[PDB]
């Protein structure tokens, strides 16, 4: 049987790379060719194209946030699961101000108005969600590894759920 031979090859290979250091954790020296490219292309490209374009986009983004009176981390959409899991655990004082800022922004945007300049002198790029995003990613990675390492077989279209993995009832067209 060829599947048995293939299974042994996979087992032996994976056993031979256990404990390997990830590529990013290796101390890597650039090749003599990438160093030349960085010496010539990268400086000129930054001065003439990348630097000005990205400053132009960044400064516009800061202005848009300041006009709405929101922070950058407010702009995250909770349809993303990491954001939703992080928002479950944020403390109440952070939550209250986040909601108020987001509500004011939508009112301003909907009515085509901008925040008064008196209230615009703040840094919008303060990363207040970072501790909770990292905790949420850790929780999700543990669940991924210890509980979702195989494609599981379940009885199909039973109890309001397709049986293909989703956990909410009536959350697909074929489960109406």
């Amino acid at each position: 049987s060829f599947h048995r031979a293939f299974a042994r090859v996979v087992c032996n290979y994976n056993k031979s790379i256990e404990g390997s250091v990830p590529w990013y954790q290796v101390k890597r020296e650039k090749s003599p060719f990438q160093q030349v490219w960085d010496e010539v292309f990268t400086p000129i490209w930054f001065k003439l194209v990348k630097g000005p374009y990205e400053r132009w986009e960044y400064n516009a983004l800061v202005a848009r946030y300041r006009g709405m009176g929101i922070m950058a981390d407010d702009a995250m959409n909770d349809k993303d699961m990491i954001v939703e899991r992080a928002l479950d655990i944020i403390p109440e004082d952070i939550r209250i101000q986040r909601y108020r800022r987001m509500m004011r922004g939508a009112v301003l945007a909907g009515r085509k108005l901008h925040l008064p300049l008196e209230l615009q002198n703040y840094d919008p790029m303060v990363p207040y969600m970072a501790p909770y995003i990292e905790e949420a990613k850790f929780q999700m990675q543990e669940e991924q590894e210890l509980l979702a390492y195989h494609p599981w077989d379940r009885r199909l279209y039973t109890a309001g759920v397709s049986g293909f993995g989703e956990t909410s009832m009536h959350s697909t067209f074929l489960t109406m």
């Binding site: 109440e92 939550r95 209250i96 509500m103 108005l113």
Partner: protein, 95 residues
Amino acid sequence: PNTKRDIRRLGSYPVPPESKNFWRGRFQVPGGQIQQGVSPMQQKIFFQWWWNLPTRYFWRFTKWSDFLIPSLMWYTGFLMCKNDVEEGTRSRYWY
């Protein structure tokens, strides 16, 4: 629907079958809020359009000016091609 925390209901009264979608868009308001309004029958219904008119168009145009350079470059391409086509036709056919 919204997040599970947002749509988690406090009351035990069952969701009416005609309001299913309405309650899937529920939000859990932190810290409370005061909402106030007046019936349109006791308000000016067209002044806000006039009051907001100049700022609306100023911010619209300043945002759309970002596309000035791209549009000019495309337009410059449009002109070169049009006149490259004329010269080609004359060279190949005209005497």
